[PDB]
Amino acid sequence: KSGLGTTAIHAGTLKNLYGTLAMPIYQTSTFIFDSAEQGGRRFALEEAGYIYTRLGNPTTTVLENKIAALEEGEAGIAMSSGMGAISSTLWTVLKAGDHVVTDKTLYGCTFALMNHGLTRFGVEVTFVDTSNLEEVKNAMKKNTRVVYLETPANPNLKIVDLEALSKIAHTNPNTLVIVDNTFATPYMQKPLKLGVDIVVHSATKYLNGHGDVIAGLVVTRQELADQIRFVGLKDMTGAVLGPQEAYYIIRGLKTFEIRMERHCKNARTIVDFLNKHPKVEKVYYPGLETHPGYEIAKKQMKDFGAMISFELKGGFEAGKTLLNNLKLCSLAVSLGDTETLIQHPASMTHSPYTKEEREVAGITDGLVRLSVGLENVEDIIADLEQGLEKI
Amino acid sequence: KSGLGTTAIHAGTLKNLYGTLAMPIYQTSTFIFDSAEQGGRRFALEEAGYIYTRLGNPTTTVLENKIAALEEGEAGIAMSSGMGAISSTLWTVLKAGDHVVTDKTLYGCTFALMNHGLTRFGVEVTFVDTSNLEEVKNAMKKNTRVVYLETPANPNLKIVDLEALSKIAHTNPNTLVIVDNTFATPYMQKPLKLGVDIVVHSATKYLNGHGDVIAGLVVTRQELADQIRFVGLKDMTGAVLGPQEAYYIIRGLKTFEIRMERHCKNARTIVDFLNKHPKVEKVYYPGLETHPGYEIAKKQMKDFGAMISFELKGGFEAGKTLLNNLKLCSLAVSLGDTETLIQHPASMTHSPYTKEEREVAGITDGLVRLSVGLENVEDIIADLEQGLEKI
Amino acid sequence: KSGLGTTAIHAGTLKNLYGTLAMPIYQTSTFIFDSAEQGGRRFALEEAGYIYTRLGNPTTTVLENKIAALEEGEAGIAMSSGMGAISSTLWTVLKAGDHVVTDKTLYGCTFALMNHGLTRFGVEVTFVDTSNLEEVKNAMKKNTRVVYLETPANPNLKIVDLEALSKIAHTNPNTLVIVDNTFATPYMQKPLKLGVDIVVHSATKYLNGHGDVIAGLVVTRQELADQIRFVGLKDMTGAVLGPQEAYYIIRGLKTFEIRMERHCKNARTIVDFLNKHPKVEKVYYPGLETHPGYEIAKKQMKDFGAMISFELKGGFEAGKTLLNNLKLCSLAVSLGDTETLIQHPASMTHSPYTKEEREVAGITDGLVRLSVGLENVEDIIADLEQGLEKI
Amino acid sequence: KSGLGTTAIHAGTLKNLYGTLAMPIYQTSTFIFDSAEQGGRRFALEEAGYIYTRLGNPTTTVLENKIAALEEGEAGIAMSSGMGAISSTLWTVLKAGDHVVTDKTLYGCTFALMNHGLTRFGVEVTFVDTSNLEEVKNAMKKNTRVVYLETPANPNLKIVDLEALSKIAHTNPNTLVIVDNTFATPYMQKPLKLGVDIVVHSATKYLNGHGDVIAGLVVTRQELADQIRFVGLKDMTGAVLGPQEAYYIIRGLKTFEIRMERHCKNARTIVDFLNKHPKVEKVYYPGLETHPGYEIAKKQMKDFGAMISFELKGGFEAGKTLLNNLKLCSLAVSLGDTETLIQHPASMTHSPYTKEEREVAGITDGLVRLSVGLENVEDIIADLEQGLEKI
Questions:
Q1: Which of B105, C145, C185, C311 could form a disulfide with C98 if both were Cys (CB 3.0 to 4.6 A apart)?
Q2: Dist. CA C53–CA D80, nearest whole Å
Q3: How many CA atoms lie less than 13 Å away from A266 in the CB half-sphere?
């Protein structure tokens, strides 16, 4: 078995006519046929090859094959955002009258899709604490079609047991388990090997890694993949990845192994610094023995990630003061970029909401979320240290 | 009022820091804030500027403003395909229990979304002949939320009266009229000026014009646009246009006026050639006085388009023989490219279906669809002429 | 013979493995061999195919073939600027001890290369008035290796007789005639058909047309082309065109015919407006019967171009006042973009120089240079008219 | 002082109007002025900002600043190939009658430029063994304008002492020392800190790192940089980097530190494997204590690189047999890509030449050149091992 760097670099490649080393950018909408009969054979699935980029594209196929190889699944599908991957999947496999079990701690736009979108179209959704196996067992119904999971998950890097939850879900023979593996990536976690049916990613984050593409990826069995491609993507979302962006992500994947290694190395060192810092009252990190679900993280994750959240003891003003004094870390949403990113949800993403509303949503006044980048760790720590001195 | 070329070239531009002549390609996922407070102000809609490309991007904003200016609507939204524009719109404005009135002659993937997708999620859809005003009146119900129209529409370039249909739809105060204006483009037809509520496009076709981008556009009133952006696009499709592709379309729009002029000039000359040709039994073209709805086309279209369909008197084998002998026209799906494209649906797109099934779908054995390109018309005609000689 | 639009759109295409309609972007540095022996055969020129993008690239080859087809020459070479095309050519064909005959009215950077660059490396250069055939005859020497010409040429759109000058040059069997055909383009002028040996272009201007690429092109006989490629480009300039930029230019060429037609249509109408305007004392345009060399322009140009210069009777302050009040025309260097561009050399490009110095260089205080774009001509004229009212 | 990763990621950034995280791609030829007077001020160097991409471009400026920061020099200049960087520099600083001292072991195209190009234009060139300090001292003349060096250099990874050679060169007050630092990169070697005047790179190799760009970079003092920009690049080569390619290289530099670390880690392990392998008679690697100049390499290089050459004891047929059996390593020219590349010069690049001719050029029948990539080292070694078994 080839190593992960070898796989990220080489897996899934397709031939080209000129033997270019780089994967060509097939920046095309349509494809020409040699004859009427060849066109007919492609539409009848009797001959291999391409028709139209919304259906598939050779640049995109390489990307799809690569992510499937990394997750050790049968088939990949690419979309023009993580929400495109998630929605295309859900619109394919659900119908009015179906039921979904999921967590309240889900990526915000996914929560909105679940709570306000799917429910408008006749889907029943129950939100439970998926760290409580009994709650999940009790929420299962005959018409549960999807159990949707995310681990680690915002804002406190909650860990849930994918293998155990999948066994519970699969007591109903019609239930699919879908996992958003964005934060962990296939460098750390391979949900399909734990019995999950479908993996989804925001490739916008670590997989691309360079903060320049919005994209999503799905990995699953061929039978399900073909439905997600030819129903969800083709007709119900149209979230078609641009060939240029497919190329950018392929290119980003050339450094995926070494980026993830450095992200995690940096992060573990920063966790130790923050957890020993007098102005930080608590650190949320899956690799701390004091983190809830540490033992689950240790079983299902090869490393503990490069996201860190932490609570400043000085609360709201401490969060703003820290961030406003940083010179290296960048104030922004998103994660998984080569540059370190940081946000203070109480003053930034959750500015429309009262303290009470924020706290109901798990956002505390001193909570800071850090996406650790690839800078020299001494420089990231020096920046945090000087900022913390100002509180 | 500026002319259409002036508008396509100059409308909607945003400033950049360096005064580059070309619109910069803001190939970014995220945006940095100067302070925590600035981030908060953007999330609270208290300060202008950007957050994250799925929400909006400055390159994409220029494109959005341009198409809104061309359609003479308030607001534009861009997506990563025409189906992204269509689906994002429909998921925003519909809910389970709503009803839709539309035509059986709709773009195939839209038909599939209507007939198999929306119906799975509790939406009622009635397909009528929207060229028959009484049929449309009779299909209206209290819960009709959308009347969805397309003109000219495949495979016989059917014309329907947008102004008249919109008046019928608007007898219900909750009904929105949505028009797919892809074929006509704002060079020929501006549905919002006829009382339509929302215009959608596959920018993959004429607007981009260069056969290298999959993209969609929506134009509507600001109130509706903001919902389509922040609900449909943000959460329910994630069909986020890549900044590179946004740039390609802006670039394509620099020649939109002159491309459409040449497309139509070429097409009218080719229509005359085909309609007088002994091996062609019938031509479908909105500008022929013998075309059904010619008088409606004359009222609502400034020119009659660059799509032509025609029936070869020799049927199925004549279609294949013609196409297999062409040297300039390219055998492919799609339309609106600078290169002339041609397809024979009976042997190509509809190869999975029996003659009976095809004929029920309006596909006759000798039907050929031609997307007239920008080549010198003498060369396009010479190619068709030599191909027709082989039948 | 195919028309110019057909040729621009279709000529020079290469196959690709997937039959994409758009030319793939082979964004690669290097190319892989199937075997050691295949690599050897390519290096020994025994097998066709690619090695490394500085030598050649399939995307770039299409562009090269297209410009060669448009100029009706044997071979094309692409570079990363017009100055790259010019310098690569000159470094290939010259040596210390050679002589060059050229005009003082040459593109400024070419003049600098001739007067200050080549002369530093042992090349003798004589600058004459190439509109005076006797001056050119008298400048010829046994060691004259290049006669370098440009028509129309800045700042007064000087016309020189390419066929006549080439006959004079070719009285020496070792002399090559090189023409910068940027302004005229192959839509108007095909110097190789008049006996010229090498044509050079700044593709930055009309050929790309979209103000987003810096690039150069050369067309000549295969024997000379191979030397320019494998000596000048390979080793002496390294002015290697990026595959992305090659694609942009191919894409720009899809509309070359219709762009040039509209550029010239607009320009002729604007010339009439300016030449009849009371505040304009003189117009420089090859198509005016009062222009020097009008009859030569009529013989060697199919149309008279889209560059216009004109003298405002109010001089220096009138130039600045006009330009500072324009709202549609953009203040910028360059030409041949879809947007109308304008400059006042006395206050802009020639700001470092005294009135005396400027006038020696042919720059008069009221001289304005206009690159007519593709906007609706009524809008361009309205903008100029309101600006002229302010003088 | 910030670490090298921090510097590569963050140095040299310019602001943009929207605070995009990624550097915008200013894919423009020209720049617009607010007024005639602003244009004049820019041409008179009285106001900062841009004019035209051949002169400079904001995307490219970021790249230039980054490489200058990495080399710890004052100013950077970018070109569209390494040969563009080299030639632009040489044409700027030389003139007919000048003399150059350099090595016979120079990159092949540079050797050709020196031996056949510059000599055609009146420059005297002496080729010496620059590992012999006395030879270099003896070659110095009053008119020596350039001492041009390269270390490590093909085909045996020759090492020369940059500090010592620079002292010899600088005994003539008019002599500039130019070093091609491509192989070593600023991760290993910073020639300006050793007294060198100008550093040149093929950014095509490690700096970009992703095998998808042809580009060059120069770093030197501001006074020299401005001459190379405004003479060499502007007029004498026109080797203008495309903004897209500038962006690709900036993007590549985000992972420069971690890529170089893994390249070298992999390479050192492969050197040990090859040097102990019974079918390999000799390994050329700067870090072997048996390599000539090992002690010089240890003084001027922080690590010993990721290029390896080696001699197979079985000669010509062994080279071909090895390469023809490899499944992971790719047969190609170039180096510094994320993928491992390999070549056998005797059968590939030097296929036109006899054994005698090859051996005079230092190419021996069993010589193999390996550019070690970023794949898992166990996989690279397994591939080499199985290939070596076939000899």
A1: C145
A2: 11
A3: 29
CATH assignment of the domain containing B19: 3.40.640.10
Rounded-to-integer distance, Cα C199 and Cα C216, Å: 11
**How are beta strands B307-312 and B367-371 bridged, if at all?**
antiparallel
Are C243 and C264 found together in one domain? no
Cβ partners under 8 Å of residue C365, min gap 6:
C315, C316, C319, C346, C355, C358
B267 and B242 both lie in a single domain: no
Q: Do D140 and D168 fall into the same domain?
A: yes
Residue B343 sits in a domain whose CATH number is 3.90.1150.10
Question: In terms of C-beta distances under 8 Å and separation of at least 24 residues, what long-range contacts does D331-334 make, across chains too?
Answer: D331/C32, D331/C33, D331/C34, D331/C35, D331/C36, D331/C38, D331/C39, D332/A21, D332/C30, D332/C31, D332/C32, D332/C33, D333/C30, D333/C51, D333/C52, D334/A21, D334/C29, D334/C30, D334/C52, D334/D204, D334/D205, D334/D211, D334/D371
For residues A216 and A93, membership in a common domain is answered with yes
- B107 assigned to active site: yes
- How far apart, in Å, are the Cα atoms of C375 and each of B4, B8, B374, D30? 8, 9, 19, 18
State whether A187 and A287 are in the same domain: no
**Chain C: residue nearest B382 by CA?**
C2
Instruction: Give the Å distances, CA to CA, from C318 to B387, C325, C369, C382.
Output: 61, 11, 14, 18
Looking at the 3D structure of chain A, how many domains does it have?
Answer: 2
Whether the bond between B286 and the residue before it is cis, its omega within 30 degrees of 0, is no
Are B147 and B238 part of one and the same domain? yes
3-state secondary structure A96-152: CCCEEEEECCCCHHHHHHHHHHHHHHCCEEEEECCCCHHHHHHHCCCCEEEEEEECC
Nearest to D120 by CA among D103, D92, D96: D96
CA distance C277 to C284: 14
Instruction: List the structure tokens of C20.
Output: 């994409």
Distance CA C35, CA C48 (A): 14
Instruction: Indicate which residue of D26, D107, D187, D247 is catalytic.
Output: D107
Under an 8 A CB cutoff, do A24 and C15 touch?
no
D57 backbone φψ class: left, alpha, beta (φ>0; ψ -120 to 50): beta
Exposure on the CB side of residue A329, measured as CA atoms within 13 A = 32
Q: Are strands A307-312 and A280-284 parallel, antiparallel or unpaired?
A: antiparallel
Residue indicated by tokens 């929306």: B118
Rounded-to-integer distance, Cα B276 and Cα B195, Å: 38
Residues A235, A298 within the same domain: no
Q: Residue A83 is nearest to which of B54, B248, B347, comparing CB atoms?
A: B54
3-state secondary structure of A377: helix
Handedness of CA A212, A216, A220, A224 (dihedral sign): negative
Looking at the DSSP bridge assignments, the partners of residue C311 are C282, C367
- The pairs formed by D351-356 with CB atoms below 8 angstroms and a separation of 24 or more are D351/C39, D351/C40, D351/C41, D351/C43, D351/C44, D352/C43, D352/C44
Resolution (A): 1.2
Q: What does the alpha-carbon distance between residue C351 and residue C346 come to, in Å, rounded to a whole number? A: 6
> Which residue range is the domain that position A80 belongs to?
4-253
Q: Take residue C245 and report the two structure tokens written for it.
A: 């930029």
CB contact under 8 A, D96 and C350: no
Of D232, D253, D274, which residue is a domain's last? Answer: D253
Question: Does D148 participate in catalysis according to the annotation?
Answer: no
Separation in Å, CA D171 to CA A141, D130, D137, D175: 88, 16, 9, 8
Task: Mark which of D253, D282, D305 sits at the end of a domain.
Answer: D253
Identify the closest residue of chain C to A20 by CA–CA distance: C31
| SS3 state at C26 | coil
Instruction: Please give the residue of chain D at the shortest CA–CA distance from C349.
Output: D43
Q: Are residues D102 and D226 in the same domain?
A: yes
B88 is in an annotated binding site: no
CA distances to B2, B369, C97, D202 from C389, rounded to whole Å, are 20, 53, 55, 54
